[PDB]
Design a protein around this ligand. Structure first.
Ligand SMILES: CC[C@H]1CN2CCc3cc(OC)c(OC)cc3[C@@H]2C[C@@H]1C[C@H]1NCCc2cc(OC)c(OC)cc21
Ligand SMILES: [Mg+2]
Ligand SMILES: [Mg+2]
Ligand SMILES: [Mg+2]
Ligand SMILES: [Mg+2]
Ligand SMILES: [Mg+2]
Length: 81
RNA sequence: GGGACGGGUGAAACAGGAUGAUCCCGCCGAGACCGCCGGCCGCGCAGGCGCCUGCCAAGACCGCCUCUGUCAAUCAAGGGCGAAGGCCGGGGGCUAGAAGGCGAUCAGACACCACCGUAUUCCCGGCCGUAAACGGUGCCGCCCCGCGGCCGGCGCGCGCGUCCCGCCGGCCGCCCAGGGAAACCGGGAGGCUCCGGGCUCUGGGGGGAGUAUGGCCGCAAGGCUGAAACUUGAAGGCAUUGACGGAGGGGUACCACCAGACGUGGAGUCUGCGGCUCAAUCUGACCCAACGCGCGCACCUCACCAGGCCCGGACGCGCGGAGGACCGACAGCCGGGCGCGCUUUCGCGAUCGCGCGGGCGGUGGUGCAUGGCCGCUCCCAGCCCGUGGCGCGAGCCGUCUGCUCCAUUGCGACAACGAGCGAGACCCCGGCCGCGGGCGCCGCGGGACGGCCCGCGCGAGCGGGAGGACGGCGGGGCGAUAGCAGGUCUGUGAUGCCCUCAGACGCCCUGGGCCGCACGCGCGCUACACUGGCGGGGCCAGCCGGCGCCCGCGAGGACGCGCGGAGCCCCCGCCGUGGCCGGGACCGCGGGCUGGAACGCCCCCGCGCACCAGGAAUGUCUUGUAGGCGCCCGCCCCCACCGCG
């Protein structure tokens, strides 16, 4: 499985926009661990958790290098003028 | 001049060439025709119109404080012009080319393709008078959204450009209203059921039939005009959804191909399927999507054939019955046998007997009356809902002519917005690691996620390299909407309606048959040998699993207890290319097992069929895979060339 279904992407986007300060991209361990938290998000199945975490890391580094539309980063401070 | 082919086709073959072709070059003759410029340019009443030079007459448009004064529009009759082909009489003869000839293609080809070639194509004079002669839209006249291009003429403005602002006329494109059955028109096909500007022509369901008979015209071919009888229930127009296409564009798959591998069809044989035979050889299914499939047929299984027992007829109503309803039997004959039948005479006692209503039962029929279960479409990626919008409407958008994915899987848009099903996720199995427990290795968890690096791409995602037990859908299960006259009434206390119901299609018993064989083929098995056959020896599997002693050559047999695994292969020798020690079909004595009963199955001696690698055709397959080798379960009294593993 390489193409990721819609559910993965939508939930991953929600997670990033919600928990951004504690998702360091480029690692598959931190993000998996954080997604394990129920205060963060709940995954019924192991494989789904790994899949979601992987997409979350790829989205997070894509964003840290160049933020995207549809994901809110509160960057006004450096673009509010 | 030079020296061997040239022509033509998808590929070829007829015609041409040492009598020098094809090719190069120069000259000569004749007759057609008028290119690239050439056009949402133009002219003309239409048909139609393209070399240079000269001559002749003509025409529309524009400009005008020119002239006349209703002189106009449309039109049967009548007159004139009129593509191409065709005809008459004269000229001319190069290309092409009806007819004709010939070579190919084809089952045929007198057609499409190739080659030769008459009339014709050209000019003069004259007939004919037809075309999808189409803008499939008659002529005159009025009003009418907006934008724009080109042609001709004239005027205004300036910074004088072949500038831009206008007017008339012409040729075009898009288009709001409006119109329409709609396609579409909008310089009208508008101003019209709110249905009257003027003139002429045509039509009244489809065929018969533009035919017959008359008339006029013409050399002719033919043109103009133009019925009836009879027959028929639809024929047609515009548009929607599907299916199909020897239509185009994107994709995809060893049930498709490339590259290979292993095979089948050639023999012998197991089995099933048609045909023949019999008393019966019981039946279902016939391209994918019937033919080792409806889970192993001596009796049952079993319907089919030859024969025979029994009522095992509930429950109600009417009549009879213990002064005796119904039921069994020793002995002798006929009967495969039975108190089956008969011949004498004993026994039993209401568990009922006859009729009428009313049952149960039945591998009997319709799978085209049905339920249920499968097969196929489908080893697919597709299917729909609420609100909203477009159309009179069936319907359309949502649900994608962009880029990606094996995938309506995703990125990014858009009169659509928002959800759902299928796909994924999901469950079983195996590879690595940990904990716990442990008669027997079996319970709970981690781990792999396109995660890291480098290239690209906004994007999702593609290519390469690592590290790791494993790297990119590892093998299976589940399986959308809608549908089929697919199979099944012979799987069932699943069933409607038919047929059978006391000489039974009920149930049971003895036999036979389903295996019978001039022949056609479907899935398989054994071989055609030296990469081998025989003998002796050594040795390791998993689904899982039972052994000792003694007789017997072996298959097997009598005892007694709980204990236990192979072929290929490797080593040593013989055989030595001979249908031979390859091959083991077929057949004759014999010894055993199961079973009430061998037609069934094993072992021993003997005989030793075809087969020398298999035509036209055709099937399957990408890693622990094909192929080769063997081992257990299923149905099973005995037996596996079958099927699941
Ligand atoms: C009109 C002549 C026909 C003669 N043949 C028959 C055999 C044949 C075999 C071919 O396979 C190689 C072939 O490929 C081009 C052509 C032929 C010709 C076919 C001719 C039939 C003709 N009409 C049908 C379709 C067709 C297609 C063609 O392909 C272009 C073609 O080539 C000239 C001719 C034809
Ligand atoms: Mg002519
Ligand atoms: Mg007309
Ligand atoms: Mg009217
Ligand atoms: Mg009418
Ligand atoms: Mg009519």
């Amino acid at each position: 499985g390489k193409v990721r279904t819609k559910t993965i992407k939508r939930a991953a986007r929600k997670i990033v926009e919600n928990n951004y300060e504690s998702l360091k991209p480029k690692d598959f361990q931190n993000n998996k661990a954080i997604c394990s938290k129920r205060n963060v998000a709940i995954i019924p199945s192991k494989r789904l958790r790994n899949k979601v975490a992987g997409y979350v890391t790829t989205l997070m580094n894509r964003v840290v290098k160049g933020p995207v539309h549809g994901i809110s980063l509160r960057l006004q401070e450096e673009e509010r003028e």
